[PDB]
Design a protein around this ligand. Structure first.
Ligand SMILES: *[C@@H]1O[C@H](CO)[C@@H](O[C@@H]2O[C@H](CO)[C@@H](O[C@@H]3O[C@H](CO[C@H]4O[C@H](CO)[C@@H](O)[C@H](O)[C@@H]4O)[C@@H](O)[C@H](O[C@H]4O[C@H](CO)[C@@H](O)[C@H](O)[C@@H]4O[C@H]4O[C@H](CO)[C@@H](O)[C@H](O)[C@@H]4O)[C@@H]3O)[C@H](O)[C@H]2NC(C)=O)[C@H](O)[C@H]1NC(C)=O
Ligand SMILES: *[C@@H]1O[C@H](CO)[C@@H](O[C@@H]2O[C@H](CO)[C@@H](O)[C@H](O)[C@H]2NC(C)=O)[C@H](O)[C@H]1NC(C)=O
Ligand code: NAG
Ligand code: NAG
Ligand code: NAG
Lengths: 48, 48, 107, 133
């Protein structure tokens, strides 16, 4: 599950609805430890 | 992330030589449809 | 509100503490206490008529540099507080000005 | 050439209406944009709002829309109105003009630009204080 919001707010150009900034968890090499990460995605690959 | 300026990817094409190319290809196309028939181009229809 | 002190004669280099991000387009004002604010530099290179050629900012080419104001030939009246009004492409419409850097010439 | 001169009541008790005008002399207000500046002691400068030929009273959202912009081209004046005022706004006010410059940095067909306002001609300013006593 991705917790995610819009990146680059209050922008008045054409490119607004793209560039969402999400955050998720992911396992590391130790299977008992987990990891937090920040990343970006375009609009056409995420769905609420 | 983004270092710099949010922009939008695009493509250019030289205007005059594209028009001349379309004017050439419609001259070759008229050999199957008499001399005077209205030829019109249009956008795509649908699909993915 | 922050101070700075430069002795007589030599140059002085002031830069505003807001981190610029994008294409820069800044202004520099000057406000003596009690008097009226005057403009010094607009559009990072230009200059209105009536200002001597001892005031020079930074040309905004090849992104990655800090905007700063350099003055040369300092004198006694150069005591007023300065301002770095800032505009970019990303941060949208601004409203504030920022903290004034107080110049205190000595000699 | 544009010259500025102010007019204010000076000493008004709080929870009232504060109206301060600036007089425009020398030229008209056909293309010039008009702003207002507040300078309170114990802090830096502060910018209030502006207006243009389309008469957009655009306000600072840190001011709770307690102020009203008023222009007059029939008799060449500008007017402020301040409603539901505080005792904590004793400050010299300023009526200065501003021009609009654009800066385009990508393509023009995508709206890939922004606007900036530069304030070149300034007023001498007048002091207006509020006091419960
Ligand atoms: C596909 O085809 C499109 C066709 O539209 C093409 O778009 C063009 O893209 C370029 C790249 O962004 C745009 O170029 C900009 O041009 C403006 C124009 O300003 C002056 O220039 C001309 C004459 O040169 C005048 O006619 C005009 O009225 C203006 O006087 C420039 O302002 C831009 O440069 C500034 O910003 C850059 C980034 O910040 C800086 O690198 C640059 O140096 C300038 O910054 C500062 O430089 C000056 C140096 O002294 C300084 O004094 C200034 O104050 C300034 O702040 C930028 O070059 C162009 O406008 C687009 N065309 C249109 C119609 O919009 C695509 O590039 C093309 N793509 C491909 C891949 O082919
Ligand atoms: C990472 O997984 C954790 C595991 O549930 C998620 O958040 C936790 O939520 C509980 C209850 O709200 C908190 O007490 C924990 O502190 C949270 N932990 C973390 C690491 O956030 C969380 O949704 C996941 N993180 C992301 C970014 O997806
Ligand atoms: C496209 O890029 C080439 C790269 O060599 C350049 O010569 C040309 O002027 C550009 N523009 C057009 C319209 O072909
Ligand atoms: C395209 O090229 C023709 C040349 O046959 C010219 O007459 C015309 O003005 C050009 N432009 C358009 C939009 O048809
Ligand atoms: C169309 O017109 C051309 C004019 O050069 C003529 O030679 C040709 O025979 C015509 N074709 C038809 C199918 O009418």
């Amino acid at each position: 599950t991705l917790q995610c919001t819009n990146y680059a707010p209050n922008l008045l150009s054409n490119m607004r609805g793209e560039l969402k900034q999400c955050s998720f968890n992911m396992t590391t090499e130790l299977r008992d430890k987990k990891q937090k990460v920040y990343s970006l995605f375009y609009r056409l690959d995420v769905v609420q | 992330d983004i270092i710099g300026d949010i922009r939008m990817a695009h493509c250019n094409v030289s205007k005059a030589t594209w028009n001349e190319t379309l004017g050439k290809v419609v001259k070759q196309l008229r050999k199957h449809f008499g001399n005077n028939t209205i030829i019109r181009f249009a956008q795509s229809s649908g699909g993915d | 509100v922050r101070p700075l002190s430069v002795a007589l004669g030599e140059t002085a280099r002031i830069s505003c503490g807001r981190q610029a991000l994008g294409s820069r387009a800044v202004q520099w004002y000057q406000h003596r206490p009690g008097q009226a604010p005057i403009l010094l530099i607009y559009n990072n290179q230009d200059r209105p008529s009536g200002i001597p050629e001892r005031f020079s900012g930074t040309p905004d080419i090849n992104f990655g540099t800090r905007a700063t104001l350099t003055i040369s030939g300092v004198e006694a009246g150069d005591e007023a507080d300065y301002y770095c009004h800032m505009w970019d492409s990303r941060s949208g419409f601004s409203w504030s000005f920022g903290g004034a850097t107080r110049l205190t010439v000595l000699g | 050439q544009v010259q500025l001169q102010e007019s204010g009541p000076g000493l008004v008790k709080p929870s009232e209406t504060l109206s301060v005008t600036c007089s425009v002399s020398g030229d008209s207000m056909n293309n010039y944009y008009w702003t207002w500046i507040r300078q309170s002691p114990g802090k830096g400068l502060e910018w209030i709002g502006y207006i243009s030929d389309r008469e957009s009273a655009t306000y600072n959202p840190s001011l709770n829309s307690r102020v009203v912009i008023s222009r007059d081209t029939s008799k060449n004046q500008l007017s402020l109105k301040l409603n539901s005022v505080t005792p904590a706004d004793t400050a010299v006010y300023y009526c200065a003009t501003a021009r609009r410059g654009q800066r385009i940095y990508g393509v023009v067909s995508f709206g890939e630009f922004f606007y900036y306002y530069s304030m070149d001609v300034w007023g001498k300013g007048t002091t207006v204080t509020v006091s419960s006593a």
